[PDB]
């Protein structure tokens, strides 16, 4: 079976980063073009009682700061079997548990920068869409109680250049409305700044929907890294957002934020990030969406690694507010 | 909907670049395979009358000169709505309006070297396919006009890398069996050479088919470009293609060339180029052509850029003619 | 037609390379998604006899040791036509008739590492799956006897960066149970290690499919390079594999091994590799297979090139033991 999903942002940006020429390159106006073509089925095999599943999926066709084209496998993509007794596993490439939680619903509208690959914290705060992942998804147990976990090599280990690895886990209970998410994300060997890292991060958070049409979540998010040099980091951040749903529109306002990074018990100062966010969508059809969004990311003005050279964050190319109309459609 | 085209092109090149090893490189028999795969759709929205257009277009899998291989958004790719009152509109990857003229008709058969990418002046003189880009395509109003307009953003701001810009127009009118084009495109804060350039490119040109068999296109290119040093450079150039179709076959002679650049005032002599190239081609099938072509490349032998380095043409490789059959098939 | 291969194999690799760091860089698991999607197609032009057919396949998504994404004419990717009297002719990225005997049955299971890219040798053995290439393949004469011939651009020239050009022919005759097969390729004008190598491989080999379940192959290879100052490089290489089939079930083991590399009529000590593998398999399906495997790499401890530096070898990574489960569903 062929899918896809047709996604086009026709986003400005506004750059305050110190330096007036950076500004004028990163800013502007460009066309952010996620669509992405995928290819999935199961089949029955005779002599196998779990159906069989796979999926390929291909990258964004044409992303802004970014070359044309995409390859297949660039999202997610695997093999796996499912039964309604024990589930779904899937091996290959696929989100860990943690970031399934921290991209939805906690990423949007466009609170990524922040709360998705933002941050401070040295080693790998988590894993986002990783390979070599086999991923066990219980079935709603009682149709309240539904578990991930997951385990697969790191990026080094991906390439042959590590032994890096993880494991995670996530869980979520619906109450009515309401729906409690907490997920933990591990990872060992995590080889930077001239150090070997662990990582260890826990999240909590709610959703709720209400037949009233105000629709929130909130998350906390707690993020601790030891270096083996002695060396120990933590930080922590929030994401929040408020929907409104009447018919054919929706309003959301989203928040999210990285507080200071501490290392080894002292608070680095200026090394927080916060995003505010606002978003009017209209479900032009069943199958699609046209959105206007508009956002302010104020990132942290920059922090040295364990190797006193600058750590990379959401933050190094600078503050900057988007202004954007999007589409999105399902097929 | 998913399309394709399947082009090869079994090409020999013998080159007279001066050098003996870089002649051997260089030429040679290659297969130059230009097949691609597409996705294309329609959408009628519900609450939204323009029905939603959307394309992606694969890469040539197996180009001459390159590596295997082709991802999905290479070639055309943009999401759009499209209503018979105003025409359409497109957003993302597409053809300048400009390029559009000088590709077809004017670059066919292997006059591209000399009027599509050839040329010895600086800066932009145009883009050719390109990315974050809105494109009006008006209806054919009364069968007889057709305008295209399109602004975007550059090759290095599409990267953050720049804040250059650009927007174009072309306009047709068909005048029984001729056709009249004109079209511009303007494109500015190009860096180059280590000077901001403004490039203005004018095109005119007239087609024609005729019942007795015969054919043809010719067009006038001026191209100026403006440095931030105040050094002007100024280049015109001309195409043309006499055909004649009789049944299942159809016989073609074409001429593309580029004549001195002119920088301040002063001819830089010896920076022209021309190509000369015939083609015979048999109409196989209704979906598909098969040809052979013979052409002859005289480049300019070099020029200097603003910076006091050689600057790239489509000459820097050498003199080379080429023999090749070919086949395309579209479905 | 839309066709794909979904292929994914969890590898765990226990590695002795001298160095335990490298021991745990290139060991462990890793999930090895082959998976691959392909587009394929025939068609009858009106005017033409000879049935047009065309193929264009994507690589692997998300390879062990390699990043995710694949792009389309990664694979075997050509135009061609055929018909019942003359056979079939192909134009574009296909197997060498040489290296189609290397792979299948020669290099499973996971024989590859000494047989298919393994070796001492200088210059270039054979290619393997090569654009630019015209590939000849008969019709089965008498339902018993066949060829392939192939001639193309080598890898440099496909970049206009060389004029290296091969050419290779295979034979096949069923006698009975037995097919036996024979195969030469010429390399010529491989520009490596400072010098210009022409590559001479030949190749012999009988396979075997009795009706009590037995089957089996064998196959020697023999490799020769010239270099232009004047060095001459032999080696020889041998794999077999036996097979026996029950039901749903497949046994097969396999050895193959690269003998000593002889450089100007001195023998090399020490540049032999060796691998045994041993693997069942379940026919889960009419439609794919599960499997097992397990296999051990004894490579080659090292050689130099004629440019005084380490020559790579499938051993240079170091020798290292395989266990491995796998799936594989064609559609
Ligand atoms: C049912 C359900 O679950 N959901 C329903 C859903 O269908 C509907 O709502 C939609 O939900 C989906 C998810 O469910 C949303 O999809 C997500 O959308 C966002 C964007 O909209 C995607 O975000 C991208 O994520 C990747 C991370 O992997 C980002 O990658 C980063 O990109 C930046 C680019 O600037 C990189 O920066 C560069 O970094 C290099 C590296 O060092 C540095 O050198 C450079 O300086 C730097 N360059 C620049 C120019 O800055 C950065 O490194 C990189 N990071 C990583 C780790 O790769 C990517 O940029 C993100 N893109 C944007 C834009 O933010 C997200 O991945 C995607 N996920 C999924 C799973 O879909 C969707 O948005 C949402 N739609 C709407 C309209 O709201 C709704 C109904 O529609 O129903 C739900 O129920
Ligand atoms: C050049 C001003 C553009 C505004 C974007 C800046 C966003 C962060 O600034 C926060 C400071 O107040
Ligand atoms: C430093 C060791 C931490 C190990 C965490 C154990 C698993 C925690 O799961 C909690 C789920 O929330
Ligand atoms: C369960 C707590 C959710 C509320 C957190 C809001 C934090 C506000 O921080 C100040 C942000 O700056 C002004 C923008 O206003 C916030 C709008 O976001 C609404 C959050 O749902
Ligand atoms: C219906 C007959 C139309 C013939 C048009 C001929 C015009 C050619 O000259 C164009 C010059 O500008
Ligand atoms: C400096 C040489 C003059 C360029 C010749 C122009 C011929 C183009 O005419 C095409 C008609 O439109
Ligand atoms: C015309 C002097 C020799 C320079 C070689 C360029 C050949 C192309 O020029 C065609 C006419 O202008
Ligand atoms: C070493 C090659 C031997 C080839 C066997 C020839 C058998 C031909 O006749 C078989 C029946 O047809
Ligand atoms: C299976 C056919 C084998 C024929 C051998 C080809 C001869 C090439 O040798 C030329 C070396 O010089
Ligand atoms: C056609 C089957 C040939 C059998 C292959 C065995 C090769 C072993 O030779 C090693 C030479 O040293
Ligand atoms: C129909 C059963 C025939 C089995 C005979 C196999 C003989 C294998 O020897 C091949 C040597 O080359
Ligand atoms: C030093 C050479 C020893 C290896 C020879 C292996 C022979 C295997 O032949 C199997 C039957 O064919
Ligand atoms: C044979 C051939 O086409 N060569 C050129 C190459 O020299 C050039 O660098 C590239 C784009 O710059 O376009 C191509
Ligand atoms: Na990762
Ligand atoms: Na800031
Ligand atoms: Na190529
Ligand atoms: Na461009
Ligand atoms: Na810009
Ligand atoms: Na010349
Ligand atoms: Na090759
Ligand atoms: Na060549
Ligand atoms: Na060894």
Do not use: C
Not at 228 to 243: P, W, Y
Not at 245 to 265: C, I, S, V
């Amino acid at each position: 079976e062929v899918y896809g999903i047709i996604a086009m942002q026709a986003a400005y940006r506004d750059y305050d980063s110190g330096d007036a020429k950076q500004d004028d390159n990163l800013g502007g106006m460009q066309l952010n073009n996620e669509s992405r073509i995928g290819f999935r089925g199961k089949k029955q095999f005779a002599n196998f009682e779990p159906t069989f599943i796979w999926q390929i999926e291909g990258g964004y066709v044409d992303p802004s700061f970014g070359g044309e084209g995409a390859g297949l496998g660039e999202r997610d993509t695997f093999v796996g079997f499912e039964s309604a007794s024990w589930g779904q596993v899937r091996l290959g490439r696929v989100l860990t548990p943690m970031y399934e939680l921290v991209d939805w619903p906690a990423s949007n509208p466009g609170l990524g920068d922040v709360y998705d690959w933002g941050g401070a914290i040295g080693g790998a705060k988590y894993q986002d869409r990783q390979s070599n992942t086999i991923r066990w998804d219980s079935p709603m147990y009682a149709d309240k109680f539904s578990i991930d976990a997951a385990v697969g090599a790191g990026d080094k280990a991906g390439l042959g250049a590590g032994d890096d690895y993880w494991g995670g886990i996530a869980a979520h209970y619906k109450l009515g409305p309401l729906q409690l998410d907490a997920a933990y994300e591990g990872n060992r060997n995590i080889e930077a700044e001239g150090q070997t890292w662990e990582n260890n991060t826990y999240l909590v958070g709610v959703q709720g929907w209400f037949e009233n049409g105000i629709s929130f979540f909130a998350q906390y998010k707690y993020m601790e890294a030891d270096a083996s040099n002695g060396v120990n980091e933590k930080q922590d951040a929030m994401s929040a957002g408020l929907m409104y749903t009447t018919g054919d529109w929706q309003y959301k306002l989203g928040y999210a934020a990285n507080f200071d990074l501490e290392r080894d018990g002292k608070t680095l100062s200026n090394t927080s990030d916060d995003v505010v966010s606002a978003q009017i969508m209209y479900f032009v059809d069943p199958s699609a969406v046209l959105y206007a969004r508009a956002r302010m990311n104020d990132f942290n003005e920059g922090l040295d690694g364990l190797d006193d050279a600058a750590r990379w964050t959401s933050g190094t190319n600078g503050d900057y507010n988007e202004y954007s109309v999007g589409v999105e459609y399902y097929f």
